[PDB]
Amino acid sequence: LKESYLEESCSTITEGYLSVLRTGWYTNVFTLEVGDVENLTCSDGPSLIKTELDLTKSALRELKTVSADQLARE
Amino acid sequence: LKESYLEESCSTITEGYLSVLRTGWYTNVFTLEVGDVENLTCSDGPSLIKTELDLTKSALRELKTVSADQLARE
Amino acid sequence: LKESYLEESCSTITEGYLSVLRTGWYTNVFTLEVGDVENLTCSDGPSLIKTELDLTKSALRELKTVSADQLARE
Amino acid sequence: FVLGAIALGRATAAAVTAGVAIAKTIRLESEVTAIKNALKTTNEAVSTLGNGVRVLATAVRELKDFVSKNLTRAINKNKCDIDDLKMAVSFSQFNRRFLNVVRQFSENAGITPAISLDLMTDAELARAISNMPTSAGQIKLMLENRAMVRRKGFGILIGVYGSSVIYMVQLPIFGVIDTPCWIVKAAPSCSEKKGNYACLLREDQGWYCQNAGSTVYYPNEKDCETRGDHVFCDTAAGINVAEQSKECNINISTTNYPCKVSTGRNPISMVALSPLGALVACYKGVSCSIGSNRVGIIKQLNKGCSYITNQDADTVTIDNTVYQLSKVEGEQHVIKGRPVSSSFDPIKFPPDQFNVALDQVFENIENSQAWVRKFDEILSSIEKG
Amino acid sequence: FVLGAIALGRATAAAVTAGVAIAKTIRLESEVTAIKNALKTTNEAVSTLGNGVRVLATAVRELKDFVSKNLTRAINKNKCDIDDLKMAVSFSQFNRRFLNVVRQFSENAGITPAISLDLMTDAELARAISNMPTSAGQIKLMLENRAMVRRKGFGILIGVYGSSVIYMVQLPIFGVIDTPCWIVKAAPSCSEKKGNYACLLREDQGWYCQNAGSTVYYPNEKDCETRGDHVFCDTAAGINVAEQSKECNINISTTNYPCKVSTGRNPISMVALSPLGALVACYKGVSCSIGSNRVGIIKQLNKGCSYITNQDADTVTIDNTVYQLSKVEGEQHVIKGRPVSSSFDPIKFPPDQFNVALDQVFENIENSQAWVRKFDEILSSIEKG
Amino acid sequence: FVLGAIALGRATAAAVTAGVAIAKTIRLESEVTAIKNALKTTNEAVSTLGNGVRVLATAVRELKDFVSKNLTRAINKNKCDIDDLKMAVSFSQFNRRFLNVVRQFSENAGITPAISLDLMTDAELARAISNMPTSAGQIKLMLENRAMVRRKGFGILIGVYGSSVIYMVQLPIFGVIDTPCWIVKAAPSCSEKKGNYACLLREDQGWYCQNAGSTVYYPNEKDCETRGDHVFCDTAAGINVAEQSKECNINISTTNYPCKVSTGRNPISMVALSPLGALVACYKGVSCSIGSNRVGIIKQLNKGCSYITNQDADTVTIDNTVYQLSKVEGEQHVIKGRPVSSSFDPIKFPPDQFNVALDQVFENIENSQAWVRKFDEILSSIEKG
Ligand SMILES: *[C@@H]1O[C@H](CO)[C@@H](O[C@@H]2O[C@H](CO)[C@@H](O[C@@H]3O[C@H](CO)[C@@H](O)[C@H](O)[C@@H]3O)[C@H](O)[C@H]2NC(C)=O)[C@H](O)[C@H]1NC(C)=O
Ligand SMILES: *[C@@H]1O[C@H](CO)[C@@H](O[C@@H]2O[C@H](CO)[C@@H](O[C@@H]3O[C@H](CO)[C@@H](O)[C@H](O)[C@@H]3O)[C@H](O)[C@H]2NC(C)=O)[C@H](O)[C@H]1NC(C)=O
Ligand SMILES: *[C@@H]1O[C@H](CO)[C@@H](O[C@@H]2O[C@H](CO)[C@@H](O[C@@H]3O[C@H](CO)[C@@H](O)[C@H](O)[C@@H]3O)[C@H](O)[C@H]2NC(C)=O)[C@H](O)[C@H]1NC(C)=O
Ligand SMILES: *[C@@H]1O[C@H](CO)[C@@H](O[C@@H]2O[C@H](CO)[C@@H](O)[C@H](O)[C@H]2NC(C)=O)[C@H](O)[C@H]1NC(C)=O
Ligand SMILES: *[C@@H]1O[C@H](CO)[C@@H](O[C@@H]2O[C@H](CO)[C@@H](O)[C@H](O)[C@H]2NC(C)=O)[C@H](O)[C@H]1NC(C)=O
Ligand SMILES: *[C@@H]1O[C@H](CO)[C@@H](O[C@@H]2O[C@H](CO)[C@@H](O)[C@H](O)[C@H]2NC(C)=O)[C@H](O)[C@H]1NC(C)=O
């Protein structure tokens, strides 16, 4: 780089950089498939697969009240 | 919506929105219980339950030096 | 504390606090060691150990394109 | 005064002050014993504090039950190297929530800036909203939009009282809905007479609202946020303005309200995007054009300021740049007139000003002219008279 | 000179610049060879760099020990489909910290703005504080409030040298404690004569500190933060002010210091909450009142400015709004006087100003009638003299 | 016009406006059926929307293959208490990406402000960059610095269309590289004559850039970020300035451009760190000195401004405070002259100004002198003449 001290105004200017400027946007569209977890049910009581299955189902159910820009009220 | 281009002052005014204003706060108080993890010890060596139990005890012992007000200098 | 209401200028002043000022920085240097996870292979197909091993190898290979304050050319 | 700086700090400082002021009451050993005596048989009860406020108390007992029933019977000889592998995979599923609360209050030093899914899950966010003290019209609106109520809370740590972490969560109440709003945008307005310029700019840009006959003005645009048509404002960051302050959109020069402007003597070229279009100010040095996503360039604009409907163009260019117009359906109107800054003289225009009423840029010109006219009469009567 | 804009960026810019200036030294191959030779036989050792600065080096060997002894003894024939199920579950506990550091540096581009529990755990945060180069009474204060030392640090990535991630953590040293402070709050003060107003407002608000005889002034209140009585400031964001800058709080009108004010001609109505109360400014078109939490409305205020002790009320209302006061114990006072704005004729008030000394407003008005009376005397002596 | 405030909000507002105007097209039922018909065979295909824009579609099918093949065959009698322990652990590894997307879109109300490793991993970030519509020289720069392309994106949620989450990720295109830049810094420049002062300060501080023959100016320093020599600017937050604006760095005094300044009458003492040194202003009340890491205090500075090369010092002290210089390597030059502030009379200096061109401070002083001479000539001519 290279720096000058300008006395007349008490300032300083540094030159020698290079620029990397943004000029647009690019869009990638994903599709995170899940499967048929709505027709799987459990009847034996507490276990590990039951807990994981309930977590997955609850996540799918709660993702349907979130909107980017619109009010779901209607 | 409806936008007017005010020419005299070089500005615009957009009408037709609806407001949703905050007017107060509501307080919910929780109580996250942990049981008696302070009375369980381990006397074999490395395992899985021992690692989990040590994490839980350490978390309790750590949380008791965090204050949201009134520095604990005493 | 102690608060005065300065009537002449319509303001207030609250005295009685105490200060805790920062006067420097202290530096700690860590060395997180991973071992020889670049020489171990899997040849049976899917399994739990293979998934964990792939995750660790990929993490090492990804952390070599990040630079704190320099760029990469040539 | 500059209204944009009298605000800027009121919204966050009023929210934290009202939160610590009520954790100071729940932290007494007299109130903690009263809360835990309501939850001795149930899991949710509505309790009144010592200073007349009402709260909602709820208890979490998923980890205490496992440690009391399942974990303790297996560990009887202090020999926790049992070959079960179900008591060691279960016990790492039950304390993920406990080990995440301890992680958020310990890095934020006791106050977190947002509600995560560990402090308050989603099934416990639709039980607080069903209980708030407001009408049934507002409660129903808040239940289909729960993600915008979690967005404006925060949590505070009360303590570890024995073996049970206690904390509290603040949530907003949206008590007034469906009341008119609007928004104002601006750009410089310059003129030339033989190479000298005479700029001008408006300074009352932002959101306004009505509320039972009283207008409010939200100057800092980090406070309000639209989702569709609705606007989510915070009432503690506005400034009550007079009802006449909508005459600056009809007659800015001949009115009598003090309409704020900023002036200058050098052009600026910019693009100020509005909700249904854009305002493009192109002056002596810059070249502008508009385009489309398919058919490239359309035409070249002229000097002066112009309004570009978002049905004519998709991109607007300032000498090298591309701006994307917003695609929202609406109506567009044009209100004719002759710009204010064409009535000034570029010579004898006053120096640069920052948030001064437009009644005073006309006085400053008049006062300086009166002395010149007065001074020429006195000279004549000395000898000519 | 607007002191609020000269600051605003100094504290953050001077903290990154001092952190990258020493990562540029450890990043060499001479130092990294020298650091890892202090850690071949112990898990922590204090080392001195090449430019004279001392650091603390600490090593982590939980994942390397598992991989070397346990894992690389069942994966023999490249067969990882073994039916142990305990190695495959132990392996996912040991590398949980390694994969969480790699995520924090890879998303923040190499510099993270806070010290998560994965970079520096709580047992290693109390071994750094016990080593800092400061007195014995400052160390004791920091050790019980570690959550406020973690809150002001950051991390930087040094490299990946072989198979070992290296990084560094910057921590603050709180070297000066227990030195007086105070805070100043303000609101507009207006007058009225036959419908004309003459406003005024102070502009020297924020925190002041003493330190061995020299006062400092922190204008942007994002710098400082209180916990109880103590105030946690950052010395790189203040501006030294003269000793007699405290004469603005005793006799504002007639000192020799330049007290800074902003004037106007249009009233503003607002509430400016203070640590032990609130200042309510109610003017022509607004209605205010105060109340409690149990009962409700208590009394209604008058036009002008007034001081509402927090032992009188719990809410303050501006025409539709409610502000909850802060419950903090203390002792209040009132200092009599005649407001400065009562001294100005509402006519012949100067235009809107922005951070000018109060001596210049009085000089601006006087300079104006100096010329009018000068002209009136010359006017008579010509024709009549 | 205050150029630093006309900006400040355009960079983030113009990015979200373009993000939501393209989600409004993919959210139709006509386009989602068309996207999901491209990925019926492969896992990536470049598709064109209905308004001409091209997107890249990628599919994630790791969880759906587990539930279809491995899982819904071990659950036949609606019994989930099996003695397997390999499905119970495998199925907790496959749904950890799915459960971390739902956590980020649900706490950020549907628009996250940064790309995490859970939305877009690292092998799907180097497949986007390989496709961007730009030249080959720019692609090679982005593929080696992928961490600085992730740093400026965001995500937006499209919906749950049956049993599959759909979202979108916006990435920046760095289409112009290797064009000159520079930076400007400043500090107060005071004078004195028998106890009175006459300050002055520049107000054009920030980053400038050529771009194919057109200078730009980025006034808010949150917009640009250096890594070595390259600086990563955003072209939507800058203001086109005339080509003569670089004349302010050769003679601010007698030029023809309008150089911006701010004046005063009371000294300020501060240190303004610059990339290869520091600028130290020491005035009537402050004591300044410099030093080094190894040997301590080296010398004490004089009154006024001075430039401290980072090859001469390591720390600079303002009356109690230590600032750490930066150790970048470069050159230095000093350009002699007599300060502008020495040309003013400390008495008869204009009142405090805020962002006025230096051309007007000399015009303000010259106008006032002329009236005194004009009025004086009358007084002599009405009696003596
Ligand atoms: C911790 O221990 C308790 C008891 O020691 C476990 O509770 C046991 O699990 C379930 C839940 O009540 C019960 O399962 C039974 O299943 C048959 C299937 O037909 C059904 O007929 C029964 O009515 C019952 O649902 C079991 O009886 C129950 N044991 C007792 C004594 O109540 C609990 O599962 C353990 N915790 C974990 C995490 O496993
Ligand atoms: C990885 O392999 C090593 C050996 O190659 C295993 O070392 C085990 O370490 C523990 C403690 O470090 C020891 O078992 C028991 O230790 C206690 C206390 O140290 C002692 O009182 C007992 O008599 C017994 O030695 C022992 O060194 C070794 N265990 C053996 C050989 O059974 C290590 O356990 C393995 N990793 C894991 C995660 O298990
Ligand atoms: C879920 O899907 C199927 C269950 O139907 C599992 O596929 C099984 O795993 C692998 C992949 O094809 C095969 O392993 C075999 O290993 C021998 C070792 O020499 C090799 O010679 C074979 O070519 C093959 O790779 C196995 O045969 C295959 N089974 C079938 C019926 O295709 C898959 O592993 C399951 N994933 C789980 C349970 O996580
Ligand atoms: C769960 O099972 C039900 C039926 O048991 C599925 O509903 C049917 O889905 C098929 C497509 O595979 C349609 O042709 C039928 O019309 C559906 N029947 C009804 C009554 O709606 C359902 O799709 C399954 N769930 C999932 C996620 O696939
Ligand atoms: C751990 O167990 C000990 C007993 O070994 C508990 O100590 C006693 O707890 C009972 C409560 O059931 C008290 O009534 C006794 O007074 C306690 N004894 C002493 C000497 O203090 C201890 O409370 C248990 N720990 C926890 C966290 O419950
Ligand atoms: C993986 O194993 C190879 C050997 O098969 C290692 O390569 C050699 O490692 C020794 C030390 O163990 C060095 O002294 C040699 O110079 C290495 N030779 C080459 C050609 O590299 C390799 O280091 C191992 N990988 C890791 C990550 O440890």
Side-chain angles (χ1 to χ4, degrees), chain E residues 193-243:
Chain E
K193 288 181 187 68
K194 274 162 301 273
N196 289 118
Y197 281 77
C199 295
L200 185 64
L201 169 67
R202 283 182 73 183
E203 281 305 10
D204 49 59
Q205 298 169 218
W207 289 90
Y208 296 69
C209 300
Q210 294 251 30
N211 182 9
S214 69
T215 316
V216 184
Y217 163 54
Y218 302 85
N220 292 299
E221 304 186 12
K222 184 142 291 303
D223 291 331
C224 311
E225 179 158 12
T226 74
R227 285 278 199 275
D229 289 341
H230 300 248
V231 180
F232 288 90
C233 300
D234 196 326
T235 56
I239 295 166
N240 286 268
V241 301
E243 180 145 279

Side-chain angles (χ1 to χ4, degrees), chain E residues 17-320:
Chain E
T17 301
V20 192
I22 191 166
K24 189 162 191 282
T25 302
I26 316 166
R27 201 169 276 144
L28 298 178
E29 204 69 35
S30 296
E31 319 288 352
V32 163
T33 298
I35 279 176
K36 288 152 74 177
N37 265 340
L39 269 55
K40 76 180 293 291
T41 186
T42 178
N43 288 330
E44 172 179 282
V46 179
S47 68
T48 75
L49 288 178
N51 57 301
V53 168
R54 317 173 47 98
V55 299
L56 174 83
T58 174
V60 194
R61 288 164 188 142
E62 280 88 51
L63 181 48
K64 161 200 196 62
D65 281 347
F66 176 72
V67 168
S68 184
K69 316 190 273 185
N70 301 119
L71 193 64
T72 303
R73 215 159 39 81
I75 301 172
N76 271 320
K77 313 301 182 290
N78 310 327
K79 294 203 180 313
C80 290
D81 202 358
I82 55 171
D83 62 358
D84 185 66
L85 294 174
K86 277 191 181 174
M87 299 281 143
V89 176
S90 290
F91 195 21
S92 66
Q93 293 179 339
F94 279 123
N95 72 345
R96 185 183 281 144
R97 176 174 178 179
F98 166 57
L99 294 178
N100 278 350
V101 166
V102 172
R103 160 174 297 210
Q104 291 182 24
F105 288 141
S106 186
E107 296 182 356
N108 289 281
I111 304 183
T112 79
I115 312 168
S116 74
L117 287 188
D118 300 299
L119 305 196
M120 166 170 263
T121 176
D122 182 64
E124 305 170 341
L125 184 56
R127 284 301 309 164
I129 295 174
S130 298
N131 273 272
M132 296 176 143
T134 190
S135 293
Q138 280 92 314
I139 294 294
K140 182 204 320 160
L141 166 66
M142 289 164 106
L143 271 164
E144 289 100 11
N145 317 331
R146 306 199 285 270
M148 292 295 287
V149 171
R150 164 196 302 283
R151 188 164 153 75
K152 311 190 191 298
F154 56 103
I156 306 171
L157 178 70
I158 296 301
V160 173
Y161 288 79
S163 71
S164 72
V165 180
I166 301 190
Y167 59 96
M168 65 179 288
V169 175
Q170 287 286 108
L171 294 159
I173 301 185
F174 291 121
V176 183
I177 60 166
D178 289 356
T179 311
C181 299
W182 63 95
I183 181 174
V184 182
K185 298 276 201 177
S189 174
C190 315
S191 67
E192 163 189 276
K193 288 181 187 68
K194 274 162 301 273
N196 289 118
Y197 281 77
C199 295
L200 185 64
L201 169 67
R202 283 182 73 183
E203 281 305 10
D204 49 59
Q205 298 169 218
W207 289 90
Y208 296 69
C209 300
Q210 294 251 30
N211 182 9
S214 69
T215 316
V216 184
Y217 163 54
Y218 302 85
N220 292 299
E221 304 186 12
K222 184 142 291 303
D223 291 331
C224 311
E225 179 158 12
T226 74
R227 285 278 199 275
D229 289 341
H230 300 248
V231 180
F232 288 90
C233 300
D234 196 326
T235 56
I239 295 166
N240 286 268
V241 301
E243 180 145 279
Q244 67 270 16
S245 81
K246 208 177 174 185
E247 283 168 357
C248 307
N249 294 317
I250 309 164
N251 184 232
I252 180 157
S253 57
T254 67
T255 48
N256 317 297
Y257 202 68
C259 316
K260 310 277 273 205
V261 306
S262 303
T263 60
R265 304 182 186 184
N266 207 46
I268 299 181
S269 305
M270 51 176 318
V271 169
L273 300 174
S274 65
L276 279 67
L279 288 92
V280 187
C282 177
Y283 283 124
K284 46 183 181 177
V286 186
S287 298
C288 313
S289 65
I290 58 173
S292 75
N293 263 347
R294 288 193 184 99
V295 171
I297 174 175
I298 287 167
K299 82 160 191 168
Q300 295 190 0
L301 312 176
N302 296 115
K303 307 290 102 176
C305 308
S306 46
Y307 182 52
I308 297 303
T309 311
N310 77 352
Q311 273 142 40
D312 285 331
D314 305 339
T315 59
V316 184
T317 291
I318 300 278
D319 197 14
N320 265 313

